[PDB]
Amino acid sequence: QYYIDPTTGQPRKNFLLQNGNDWIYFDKDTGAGTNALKLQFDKGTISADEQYRRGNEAYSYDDKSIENVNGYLTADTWYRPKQILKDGTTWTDSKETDMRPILMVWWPNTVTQAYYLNYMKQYGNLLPASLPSFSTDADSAELNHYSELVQQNIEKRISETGSTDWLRTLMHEFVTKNSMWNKDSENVDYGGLQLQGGFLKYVNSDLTKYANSDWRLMNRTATNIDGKNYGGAEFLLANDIDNSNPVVQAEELNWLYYLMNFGTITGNNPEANFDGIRVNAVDNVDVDLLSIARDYFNAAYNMEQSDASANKHINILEDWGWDDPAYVNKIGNPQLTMDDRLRNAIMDTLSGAPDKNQALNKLITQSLVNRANDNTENAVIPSYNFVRAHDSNAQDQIRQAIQAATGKPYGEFNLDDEKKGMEAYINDQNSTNKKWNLYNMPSAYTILLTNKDSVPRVYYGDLYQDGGQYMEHKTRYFDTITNLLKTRVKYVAGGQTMSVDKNGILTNVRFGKGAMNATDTGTDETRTEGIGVVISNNTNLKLNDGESVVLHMGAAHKNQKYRAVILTTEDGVKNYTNDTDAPVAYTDANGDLHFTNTNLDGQQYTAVRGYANPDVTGYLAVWVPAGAADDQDARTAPSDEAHTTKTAYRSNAALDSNVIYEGFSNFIYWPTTESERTNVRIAQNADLFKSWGITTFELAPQYNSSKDGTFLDSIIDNGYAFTDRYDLGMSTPNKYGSDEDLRNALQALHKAGLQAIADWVPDQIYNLPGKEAVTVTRSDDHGTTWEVSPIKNVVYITNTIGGGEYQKKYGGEFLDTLQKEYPQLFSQVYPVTQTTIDPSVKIKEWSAKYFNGTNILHRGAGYVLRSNDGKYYNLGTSTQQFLPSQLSVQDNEGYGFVKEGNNYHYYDENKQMVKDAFIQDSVGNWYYLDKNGNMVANQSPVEISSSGTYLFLNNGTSFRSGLVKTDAGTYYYDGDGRMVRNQTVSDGAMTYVLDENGKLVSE
Ligand SMILES: OC[C@H]1O[C@@](CO)(O[C@H]2O[C@H](CO)[C@@H](O)[C@H](O)[C@H]2O)[C@@H](O)[C@@H]1O
Ligand SMILES: OC[C@H]1O[C@@](CO)(O[C@H]2O[C@H](CO)[C@@H](O)[C@H](O)[C@H]2O)[C@@H](O)[C@@H]1O
Ligand SMILES: [Ca+2]
């Protein structure tokens, strides 16, 4: 049972020997001999091709074997194959860390497969440099050959590097290049409020049931309560919060309570709580929110009782739509509407360039109040007004100045870029001709601060330079505007008149406290109160001789000395903070002040005419009575009389005694030292703000920025874009300081007697880290389906799960207290939902079920993998378990080597019988199927073309690299199974000389 050679002591291995009628084969490994006539085809044998197909099957359908989201696969999915073709030669069982790209073995179509090949060659160096680009009409057997080559080379590089880090990077660079897996398939569009280039709304589906909702009532603003009109746009930025969901409404009330009790809750400090709210982005959320805030303020503070109790919680709305005020009035003015009619009237008549400004009459009429003869109180809708804001006429223009100074694209910049752009912006601000800055700021502010029936709001960026550390550098307007502000406290009260004469000159008059009309003789205090204002927008203004401008100061101001507050000059303006050296004018017996093209009593700049300089383009002059005492205070304290009417705020002299300060810019820089922190510095200046007549300080939103860079808010970290609703400089400082600095700022403000406003931002949330498969439809900013988009009821990977430790710590936690203390809040039916808030479920973590949708994320229409027929692949979690065919376990009945009669056939991948071909098995042997499809296994010399002489043992294996000793001589078959003739050969140590018939001569 061994055949050794007795002379050389060597055994013969892989040797077939004839012993009479007996045939003995001595095997490869040990030379162990066995009856050659009894060798049988191993019926468990598989082909080399079959092993390749099986190695690439998924190890399993568990979460760890196949990277997924809710069971769905993505173009980025890596998986654990059953076997790894290690170093591109040896099939080896996979470990659980042997994850591989699904795109190494599967493609959505053969076009993509071909692009994959060209990309892996050109960018991965995974195929020979000089190989033709693969074509659209590329053969599928050619594509498959070279896909296997790529596999082999990938495993080769993985072996030299011991890593797939390079491969994660390369595959995602490749993915990113396909239209179906990038923004090209998302219909990028910036129309309306698609500030980030597009929206996807969340829709109910059986495929993604955990993200379904009974609510998602969209666009339901003050003009669209029932849902039958268009309303404002529901969609704005980032992840849009579904505020029509009763459970979400309860969570907004929870958060509102937190802000109003922030100092108690976070530091046991009753002096560190906010006093009011700014409702941010009102026209972008369910208007039910205005009613929920009202009801809570009514239960906690008794807002509607009297002016005294209401005015102790000044609240304002960011409500841009022109039909909003009537609505705000209808529901009790729980928060002040803005007067956008009036702000626009200022933009149109003062704030434009000399050749853009319109006649000044509109300042009198285009407003919630007609100011021709404003001589009553409690008769109009109460409002706040303003000239600029952190966004309005600041953020766009500043980004223009940044782009112009640096050359970078719009809205992209680093801190050096901001600074250079700020330099350019401030130079523009200080020119006569302005490109990025508003004109006539002195006049605009004079209108702002002398209007009756208005709570004016002063903007930080008009007192201090927008870019820089908090309060670092003053604007050119600081003296002018603060002069106006202290003058407002001291003199501005009572009735108002406005008219525009024949020369287009506006005269604006306040009578002082105790007089509503020009005919009222007023009280004691009236005498040295009131104000007279002359404005023109005509840089070329010239009055003709004799012509004049009359201010009708009134019957309380007959034969009286007035002195200048502000005069226009050639290069600017002159400010006078009191009576010293201020030019004078005298009223006549009628109380009329007269100006002409001539100076009064030889005093320079007391004549009326046009100027054009960095402050004034047109004309500004402001006059008050002389000889007011230095402590004169013209304000009116709110009455604690019971309200006859269901409202909170009333438009009167007490409300008119309030000034809001918007105390930030988007462009405040990050502090370089703790003393530079906005909120520390706010704490140091509360008396300064009080001196200006500021009664409420509007703080920036204090939520920690997402810092994700997906919008201006998360570039300069203003606080409008955040992940965690309850993290107010707590996890780490916000741009303005720690939560400690915040509390100290609030406590210091309260010490001065100032209120403080929390910016309430219930529209949206940014940068949630947890992925979620959601059925989405591409849509405009109202959620109207984008008709040309193929993204329609399509599963899509969203970033919708998370919210921070503070949302987790506090979400829903005060709902108990609220039920206990104010049960009345939980019984109110709100107008859009027509049911109550729902406190029975606490939100401690966000997921898609609580969102109306998201900006487009640039993952691509096809990112979530589906078969040709539209069926989604899935592990089995969210829908039917269905995996690609190359990952799936295949039925092998009829495939591979099948016995039929006394023959073995081989049926290929298409179940095709193979004829006249060699097939290699997974362990290295070759087999030949003859022209009839029949495995040869007869142990006889046979001629085969592709001619050579082959011999196949009874188990069908091609005999090869060995000797055959028959009674008629010995033959040698080479490494390819072909008989050798007529040469000397060497196989290892053995040398074999063969003649022309193949017979062995010597060895
Ligand atoms: O900022 C873009 C755009 O948003 C509006 C919406 O009213 O501004 C308010 O809401 C945004 C998201 O909360 C903030 O970016 C913005 O600062 C805030 O005032 C529009 O005013 C502004 O044009
Ligand atoms: O808001 C109306 C406005 O949206 C536009 C472009 O911003 O169209 C989008 O919204 C449509 C509503 O019918 C989709 O059907 C459409 O595919 C998409 O362009 C404007 O056409 C339309 O005036
Ligand atoms: Ca919204």
From TrEMBL:
Domain Glycoside hydrolase family 70 catalytic, chain residue ranges per copy: 102-902
Binding of Ca(2+), residues: 234, 240, 284, 763
Top-level taxon in the UniProt lineage: Bacteria
A Gene Ontology molecular function term of the record: dextransucrase activity
Cell wall-binding repeats: 915-935
EC id: 2.4.1.5
Alphabetically ordered keywords of this record: Calcium, Glycosyltransferase, Metal-binding, Repeat, Signal, Transferase
GO biological process, one term: glucan biosynthetic process
This protein's record includes keyword Transit peptide: no
Calcium as UniProt keyword: yes
Catalytically driven reaction(s): [(1->6)-alpha-D-glucosyl](n) + sucrose = [(1->6)-alpha-D-glucosyl](n+1) + D-fructose
Recorded family membership: Belongs to the glycosyl hydrolase 70 family.
Function field: Production of extracellular glucans, that are thought to play a key role in the development of the dental plaque because of their ability to adhere to smooth surfaces and mediate the aggregation of bacterial cells and food debris.
Name of the protein in question: dextransucrase
Naturally occurring in which organism (per UniProt): Limosilactobacillus reuteri
